[PDB]
């Protein structure tokens, strides 16, 4: 059973687009793969942060992950910061990484990649996700892994990166993104039904009046068919067949409700957890698991380098 | 009342200049200060090492400090890596330090440029009031004070701002060999230095062949008679006698017995240290003392760590 590590930044709120990109894809692999989801709060402080926004974002993200079906008794969801081994191994890896490598991509900004390498390597990670802009982060990680294996002990497995792009409702050519100035460009998983509906019905389209798919010729309608597709558990072409004698108004109206119904259980559950202390227990349990495992790999690192006794 | 934090490198061998310079002086402040002696193995790995000799030096240093009169009941002696908060706080301090101030001190290994915030973390973690002076610790301490103040201001106010404490005129001890040089273990001539574990026989050999003058007067003046005044300084401190008594004592006498007598004085000073070192170095009582100190340090350090985390928004 291969093992996967996903480093997940607590950055406030998840768009539908990114839920469909990563979240959904990797949450489902929890039964076939041994899977870790690490809220990387120590990487978040490499940029300016309000202390309150940060604790808020961390809880919030944890709640969503569980709300979207992550099973804490099969996968390991935890907060980086609560597993001291990360900083510890993070520091040993600083003593193996060179500056040159790091300048080629505030101090923690320049020197978090060794800590990132440490995040993945502490767990014997076989696989990492394709976070857009991780192509050079994984390369370093791989390299640092190889450099430590040669110089001390083969203890690290060399991690691999093994694999629907949701575009803006306002502009089909732009990717859906939380930082989009226009609030109607994107849907967040906690959007209320009322507002969910509004954003879909005003989503830019064509005039052709025919629900059909081609990306570079009907990008707005194509995108909508792709959302409908994933959230509704159907194929695009079935949907074409289904809207044969129909126009965008019925389509947009039906899609609205599909989306409301796909997000209702997720919301319902978010709010049960966000307030509960059950959420804290889950996170306590996750940190215990990760420490138990991360500490074994740490001691080896320490023994490989010679740090105690 | 005041607490001192002494960060001490496990480098494999300690000269006489060190015992009299740092160790002795700061192990004496033991009762009038809550004093920490931290074996900084995570600073050690910024430069190349053999995992065997590093492990060895770590014990060696622990054993030496005890052997020299460090009281595990009054001072906290511990290993840096064995208290995780250092790594944790250190990482937090990297998120406060800018690259420039770090770039203004030293493809090279990253932890060699980025250790100063970890040094900051080491000290600030204990609410340290005072620190020893080191060779090039001036520029290091200045950065720590900045990071302390920068963080007090921006997040919460939790760090005390530390100060260099100057000990009771620590004597700088010079080579036996070239008296203008400072005593150093790296010198390629083992005659030039004396280490606390030198056998009485090698102690004796080295002292007799220590560089002097062509006068044959045992008289202290630093600029014209550096060999002799270095030895007088050594005789003074291990002797517990003033240089004046030693000029009195060695009036109508020449370098012959001056070196003979000093030799026996050094042997006798180093004997208890050696007998005691050789008990601890093999026994498990040492391990017990290093477990206690790690425990004490962790309890203190973890409280401050919680404050830093609350102050920045990590965890819950």
UniProtKB/Swiss-Prot annotation, chain B:
Subunit structure of this chain's protein: Homodimer.
GO biological process, one term: tryptophanyl-tRNA aminoacylation
Location of the motif 'KMSKS' region: 182-186
Enzyme class: ligase
GO cellular component: cytosol
Function: Catalyzes the attachment of tryptophan to tRNA(Trp).
Family membership noted in the UniProt record: Belongs to the class-I aminoacyl-tRNA synthetase family.
Source organism (scientific name): Bacillus subtilis (strain 168)
Highest taxon of source: Bacteria
Name of the protein in question: Tryptophan--tRNA ligase
């Amino acid at each position: 059973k291969q093992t996967i590590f996903s480093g997940i930044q607590p950055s406030g709120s998840v768009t539908l687009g990114n839920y469909i990109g990563a979240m959904k894809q990797f949450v489902e692999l929890q039964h076939d793969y041994n899977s870790y989801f690490c809220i990387v709060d120590q990487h978040a402080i490499t940029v300016p942060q309000d202390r309150l926004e940060l604790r808020k974002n961390i809880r919030n993200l944890a709640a969503l992950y569980l709300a979207v079906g992550l099973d804490p008794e099969k996968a390991t969801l935890f907060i980086q910061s609560e597993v001291p081994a990360h900083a510890q191994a993070g520091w040993m890896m600083q003593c193996v990484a060179y500056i040159g490598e790091l300048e080629r991509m505030v101090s923690g900004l320049l020197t978090y990649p060794p800590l990132m390498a440490a995040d993945i390597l502490l767990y014997g990670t076989d696989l990492v996700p394709p976070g857009e802009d991780q192509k050079q982060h994984l390369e370093l990680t791989r390299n640092l892994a190889e450099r430590f294996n040669k110089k001390y002990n083969d203890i690290f497995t060399i991690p691999e990166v093994k694999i629907a792009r949701i575009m803006s409702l306002n502009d089909p050519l732009k990717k859906m993104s939380k930082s989009d100035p226009n609030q109607k460009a994107y849907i967040t998983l906690l959007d209320e039904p009322k507002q969910l509906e509004k954003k879909i019905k005003s989503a830019v389209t064509d005039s052709e009046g025919i629900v059909k798919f081609d990306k570079e010729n009907k990008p707005g309608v194509s995108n909508l068919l792709t959302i409908y597709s994933i959230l509704g558990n159907t194929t695009i072409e079935e949907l074409e067949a289904k809207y044969e004698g129909k126009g965008y108004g019925e389509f947009k109206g039906d899609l609205a409700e599909v989306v409301v119904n796909a997000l209702k259980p997720i919301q319902d559950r978010y709010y049960e957890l966000i307030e509960s202390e059950e959420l804290d227990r889950i996170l306590d349990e996750g940190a215990e698991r990760a420490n138990r495992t991360a500490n074994k790999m740490l001691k080896k690192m320490e023994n490989a380098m010679g740090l105690g006794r």
